């Protein structure tokens, strides 16, 4: 993906699994979960952002 794009989450235990977020940053370093995605819904913990990997994220 690229920064600022809209993505549909594919991590089955995510709060936002099959919901749309927007990509904040992507880390070039060897990070296991380099895609930073922000959402408009908060999770049950009140967090509105999470890190993801490329194989857990699809552009819409």
């Amino acid at each position: 993906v690229k920064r600022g794009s809209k993505v549909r989450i594919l991590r089955k235990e995510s709060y936002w699994y099959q919901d749309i977020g927007t990509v904040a940053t992507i880390d070039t370093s060897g990070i296991r979960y380099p895609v930073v995605v922000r959402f408009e819904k908060v999770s049950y913990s009140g967090v509105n952002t999470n890190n993801f990997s490329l194989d857990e994220v699809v552009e819409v």
Binding site: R11, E13, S14, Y15, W16, D27, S29, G30, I31, R32, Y33, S43, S45, V47, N50, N51
Partner: protein, 80 residues
């Protein structure tokens, strides 16, 4: 004792380690997150099972997971 696990989704925020009332958790060096550090559970015999670490954790599903197990004098928090 209780079983406390740290999954590789840990962003190294150290919040679980600061919230732990029994010094169960500490930070060890890593290279899988930007912070360069991951939570660790070297002293789970002292874990009382409060799950204050899980409350502190900000990853979408908890990087730190407490699994309540056999009860002891330490994990039952008995001063008697």
């Amino acid at each position: 004792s209780h079983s406390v696990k740290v999954y590789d989704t840990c962003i190294g925020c150290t919040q679980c380690v600061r919230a732990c009332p029994c010094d169960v958790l500490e930070m060890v060096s890593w290279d899988g997150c930007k912070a360069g550090q991951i939570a660790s559970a070297p002293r789970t015999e002292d874990c009382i099972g409060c799950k204050r670490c899980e409350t502190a954790c900000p990853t979408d599903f908890l990087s730190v997971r407490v699994y309540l197990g056999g009860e002891t004098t330490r994990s039952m928090g008995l001063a008697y």
